[PDB]
Each structure stands twice: as structure tokens, then as C-alpha cells.
Amino acid sequence: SDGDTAMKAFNDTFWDPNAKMFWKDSKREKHQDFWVEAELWELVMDAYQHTSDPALKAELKTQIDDVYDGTVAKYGQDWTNNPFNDDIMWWAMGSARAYQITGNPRYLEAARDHFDFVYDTQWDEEFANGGIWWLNSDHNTKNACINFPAAQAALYLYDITKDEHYLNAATKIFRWGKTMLTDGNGKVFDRIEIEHGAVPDATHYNQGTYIGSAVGLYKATGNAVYLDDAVKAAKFTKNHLVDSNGVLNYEGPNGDLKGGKTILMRNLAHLQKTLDETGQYPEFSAEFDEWLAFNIEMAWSHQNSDHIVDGNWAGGTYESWSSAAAVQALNG
Ligand SMILES: OC[C@H]1O[C@H](SC[C@H]2CNC[C@@H](O)[C@@H]2O)[C@@H](O)[C@@H](O)[C@@H]1O
Known part of the structure; x- marks a missing residue:
């Protein structure tokens, strides 16, 4: 049960049962940033769905509610007093899953209320x-x-409700994003700025959410173009966001990007399951599975004696966001 071991160790090192929030690092001086906390909430959910130890499973189910309470x-x-629309939407997505x-x-x-506001x-x-x-304060960038x-x-809201309103929204947002925030061959751009244009800087977490939304649209619509979209963005990640040995990059020193592999790994697991189930892209599927397994093994070979892995997977304070990616990778 490497996934169980990894999650228990992450909780032991970083979970604060008194405040019901994760600590930002192992000094236990400051709790995690708001938007990142939603991503650690989803990690708890993923470990809940992965485990087959019923005692740990019940413990993690209670933790889903405690994270929200804290x-x-x-x-x-x-959360509509927060000027960051991304902060709001990360929590809206987490709430749909909860x-x-x-x-x-x-x-x-x-x-529903937070999705609607945005x-x-x-x-x-x-x-x-x-x-x-x-942002909902100044309107300078998308x-x-x-x-x-x-x-x-x-x-997620379409799956819960069956209300076509939500499927229509997803289709409209994704069409826009593919056209204005990608190159058409799987490279996802950070943003488009007013008075400037596209800023074509790619990162792990944006490759991830593009891939997850494309796989969800494939399943909901039956249009094979969406699966092709997801495959092109996964190939781009594997060939161009890695070091010379094929290990996923380290994105520091920026604090928001350092743990981005957490989001990427969550979404790559969705594509892997859809390829295994449909049997589509069999040649890419075999290469992709082998590359993922190589990445997970290299990461876990760098664990310390408390079973914590720093986010620099190619090589004394540990950080919860940086360290989450290796735990996510074993719970997919
Ligand atoms: O370059 C990393 C990242 O920075 C911001 S998003 C991060 C913010 C989310 N809201 C809370 C803030 O404290 C946080 O910096 C955006 O510029 C985004 O496009 C970019 O990828």
C-alpha cells in the first residue's frame, strides 16, 4: 500500500487537527495558502477513492469535512469577497467533488453559487x-x-445535475480556451493580456487542467476530437516540460508553481484510465504508462526516512505543496 503509506506520512508531517488546515511547511509556523488548500482537499479525496483499508478510508472521509470546516x-x-476568480473556482470545483x-x-x-458568480x-x-x-477587481488579463x-x-456540475446549462458552459469555455490559450498542438499558454496579447509560457498545472477538461468533454459528448486534444497536450508535457532524462521539471522558485505536478498528475491519471478503457491510441498509451511509472519510481527513490518526497524529483525543511505531488502520484 505505497499510496496509503504516502498519505499517512503527509498527514503526520503537515496536518493540523486543531486548526483543521494543512501547515505550509514542517516548521508548523504558518498554514497553507487558500487556493493551494483546495488542491490538498482534492488530494484527501483522491486518497479516499484509492485506498482499500476501510479504517483509513473512514478517517479520510471525515477529513474531507474537516478541511472545509477549518x-x-x-x-x-x-468566497465572493476574494478578488481572485481562480481562488473561487478552485474551491467551487473541490466543493462539487465533496x-x-x-x-x-x-x-x-x-x-453552484460560486460557479454562477464567476x-x-x-x-x-x-x-x-x-x-x-x-480577477473580479481589475479586468486586465484572462x-x-x-x-x-x-x-x-x-x-462536475453537469454530472451531478444533468442540467444542459453546465454542459453548454463547459463546451463554450473550452472552445475559447483551445483557440486563444493554446497553439493547437497541445502547448497551453499562461494568459492573454489586454494591450499586449498572449503570454505563451507553459506550466505543469495548466497542461493538467486543459487535459482534465478535454477528457471530461470526450466522455460527456462522444466527440473524439476532445480525446485527440488531451493526447496532444500530454505528448507536449512528456517531451517539453521534462529534464534531459525525461523526469518532470522543477518549477521553483515561484511558490504557486513549485507544487504544480500535483495538479498535472491528478489529470494525467484521468487520461490514462480513459485510454486503458477505450483501447484508443494503443502505441502512445504504452509509452505514456512507461514514462509515468519511471517518473513515480524516480520520485520515490528520493524519499526521506519519514516517507516524504521533496518536489525536486531529480534530487532540511519540507513544504506541503512541493511534497504533495509524490503522494498524488501513488493515489491515481
Ligand atoms: O506564475 C504563476 C501564476 O500566478 C498567478 S495565479 C497565483 C495566484 C492565485 N491567487 C492567490 C495568489 O496569492 C496567487 O499568487 C497567475 O499569473 C497565473 O496565470 C500564473 O500561472
Whole structure:
């Protein structure tokens, strides 16, 4: 049970049962950033779905509710006072998943109300012919880190509700994003800035949410073009966001990007499952599976004696966001 071992060690090192939040690092001086906390929430959910130890499973199910409670105690229930639309949407997506797992109606209202605020008021047709703004304060840029997560959140809400409103939203957001925030061959651009144009800088987490939304659209629509879209973005990641031995890059020193492999790995697992089930792209599937396994083994060979792995997978304080990626990789 390497996935169980990895998750237990992550909790032992970083979980604060008193505040019901993760610590930012092993000094236990400061709790994790708001948007990153939603991604650690999803890690708890993924370990819950992966494990077959019923005692650990029940423990992780309780933790799903505690993570939300601790964040609500510090930040409130209404997140629309946060000027970052991406922060809001990461929590809306997490809330949709928490509803799928628990059935607790507070999570459905949280997902729906926050999705609606962003989509209904922060979509604009004028600048760049579409897209959602990064912030709800100033309107200067439209970014991959809000647009693709918004498509993914719409797809979860469609699965829950069967309301075509959400499928129509996902289709519209993704079409815009593919056209304005990619090169058409799987390279995902960070953002488009008013008075400048596209900033074509690719990162692990934006490759990830593009891939996850494309796989979700394939499943919901039956259009094979969406699967092709996801494969091209996975090939780009494997060939161009890696070191000379094929190990995924380290994206520091930026604090938001350092743990981005967590989001990438979560979404690559969705593509791997869809390829295994459909038997499509058999040649790429075999190469992709082998490359993933090589990455996981190299990462875990760098673990310390407490079973924690730093985010520099190619080589004394450990950080929760950087260290999460190796745990996610064993819970997919
Ligand atoms: O270059 C990393 C990253 O930086 C921001 S998103 C990160 C912010 C999310 N909201 C809370 C902030 O504290 C955080 O910096 C955006 O410029 C994004 O497009 C880019 O990829």
C-alpha cells in the first residue's frame, strides 16, 4: 500500500487537527495558502477513492469535512469577497467533488453559487472574443488557471445535475480556451493580456487542467476530437516540460508553481484510465504508462526516512505543496 503509506506520512508531517488546515511547511509556523488548500482537499479525496483499508478510508472521509470546516472558520462561507476568480473556482470545483463523495447539500450550494458568480458575471465577449477574467477587481488579463478549472467545474456540475446549462458552459469555455490559450498542438499558454496579447509560457498545472477538461468533454459528448486534444497536450508535457532524462521539471522558485505536478498528475491519471478503457491510441498509451511509472519510481527513490518526497524529483525543511505531488502520484 505505497499510496496509503504516502498519505499517512503527509498527514503526520503537515496536518493540523486543531486548526483543521494543512501547515505550509514542517516548521508548523504558518498554514497553507487558500487556493493551494483546495488542491490538498482534492488530494484527501483522491486518497479516499484509492485506498482499500476501510479504517483509513473512514478517517479520510471525515477529513474531507474537516478541511472545509477549518477553511470556513478562517475565510467564511461566501468566497465572493476574494478578488481572485481562480481562488473561487478552485474551491467551487473541490466543493462539487465533496458533494459527489458525501451527499451533504452544503457542498452542492457552495459549488453552484460560486460557479454562477464567476461564469455569469466574469465572462466577457469583447476582449479576445471571449473568456473569463482572472480577477473580479481589475479586468486586465484572462488566464488558463481560471478558464480550464471553470470548464472542469461545469463538467462536475453537469454530472451531478444533468442540467444542459453546465454542459453548454463547459463546451463554450473550452472552445475559447483551445483557440486563444493554446497553439493547437497541445502547448497551453499562461494568459492573454489586454494591450499586449498572449503570454505563451507553459506550466505543469495548466497542461493538467486543459487535459482534465478535454477528457471530461470526450466522455460527456462522444466527440473524439476532445480525446485527440488531451493526447496532444500530454505528448507536449512528456517531451517539453521534462529534464534531459525525461523526469518532470522543477518549477521553483515561484511558490504557486513549485507544487504544480500535483495538479498535472491528478489529470494525467484521468487520461490514462480513459485510454486503458477505450483501447484508443494503443502505441502512445504504452509509452505514456512507461514514462509515468519511471517518473513515480524516480520520485520515490528520493524519499526521506519519514516517507516524504521533496518536489525536486531529480534530487532540511519540507513544504506541503512541493511534497504533495509524490503522494498524488501513488493515489491515481
Ligand atoms: O506564475 C504563476 C501564476 O500566478 C498567478 S495565479 C497565483 C495566484 C492565485 N491567487 C492567490 C495568489 O496569492 C496567487 O499568487 C497567475 O499569473 C497565473 O496565470 C500564473 O500561472
